[PDB]
Paper text:
[name]. The three-dimensional structure of [name] has been solved revealing a conformation similar to that of other TetR family transcriptional regulators. In vivo and in vitro experiments revealed that 3-methylbenzoyl-CoA, the first intermediate of the mbd catabolic pathway, is the cognate inducer molecule that interacts with the [name] repressor allowing transcription from the PO and PB1 promoters.
The N-terminal 14 amino acids, residues Thr-46 and Lys-47, and the C-terminal 10 residues in the structure are disordered. Helices α1 to α3 (Ala-13 to Phe-54) make up the N-terminal DNA binding domain and contain the helix-turn-helix motif. The larger C-terminal ligand binding domain of [name] consists of helices α4 to α9 (Lys-57 to Val-204). A 2-fold crystallographic symmetry operator (arises in space group I222) sits parallel to α4 and generates a dimeric arrangement. The dimer interface is formed mainly by helices α8 and α9 with small contributions from helices α6 and α7. An electrostatic surface representation of the [name] dimer structure shows a positively charged patch at the N-terminal domain of both monomers, which might contact the phosphate backbone of the target operator region as in the cases of other TetR family proteins. Binding of 3-methylbenzoyl-CoA would require the movements of helices α5, α6, α8, and α9 in [name], similar to that described as the “induced fit” mechanism of QacR bound to its ligand.
Author numbering:
A (entry chain A), B (entry chain A): 15 to 47, 50 to 206
The structure:
Amino acid sequence: ASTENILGCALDLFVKNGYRATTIDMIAARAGLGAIYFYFKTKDAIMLMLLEEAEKYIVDPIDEYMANAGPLADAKLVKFINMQALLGVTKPQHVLLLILVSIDFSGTGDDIEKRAKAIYRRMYGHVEQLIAQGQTEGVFRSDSGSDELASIVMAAHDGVLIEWYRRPNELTGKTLTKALRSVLLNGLIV
Amino acid sequence: ASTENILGCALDLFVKNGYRATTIDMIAARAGLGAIYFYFKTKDAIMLMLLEEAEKYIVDPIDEYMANAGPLADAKLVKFINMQALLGVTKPQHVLLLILVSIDFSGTGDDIEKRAKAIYRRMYGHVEQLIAQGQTEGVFRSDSGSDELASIVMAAHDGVLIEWYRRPNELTGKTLTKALRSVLLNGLIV
């Protein structure tokens, strides 16, 4: 709990300030603690640990929940969309780390970025598989590759979350979910 | 040109390192220059100036190009999508600033973030208007608000760009454009 307390405060600070601006001193004060160094040697160690939490909450569960959704790929896609929305409400900080730590701009450095890139690819792979299945079933269109279509699904998902970070006083994590689902399934055209 | 040289190098560095890790010393060395301080008093000043460039390249042109696209809203949406793809190929760094400087995680601070948030909203507004027009025309669906649908279009766009930053050796700025257009217009379902 002293450990959870550290991780959660770090996570809040990274999200509000960025990784570079956040310091162990700041995390320690917020967490209510020298103490911090005995749990984690460095700030580094703290982000890496946060990435593992993210993988556990966001990514580890996907294979089973997808397998068990159905009967066809459309129901599975809806399930993925609904699970992501739920994570966006309840664990948005973890989601944001996966989306942004996995690019240079975040300022974490290559070791941390590489771990996030890997976790992202694991998630994406499940989406690409789902799309491919639907194409086999005749549920989803086949005029584009499952790889490209999956990227679109992940891109929309990433953007929606970032948009909450952009305008929290005007929307919630769920505000955009129906529109997201509607567009991904049937598009804008009547 | 000495000014362009500074801005372009700063922009490259911010994108690769993040804003906080980048220093005027680093920008000055890359740019081939005390000199820097006479053009720009601070790093700050440099990002703000980059935000103005971004508004000029990305946002200022939208109203006219949209007005002149047609005849109906579908053609206009395609035009917006194609223009954004083009910016993603040619001025990706500027696009990335608008998407990410407009949230806390980027680490720029409130003044800079607020300017980016404003520029973003201006772009979004044009998209919301386009969607609303299409709804009036009977081209686009009306079971969701034009505000929510517009957010989905912007979200997909933001994510696609970030995905290039994520995996540049596996895709280009254009790789995802057909799939993006296809999904936004007609969705995944056959």
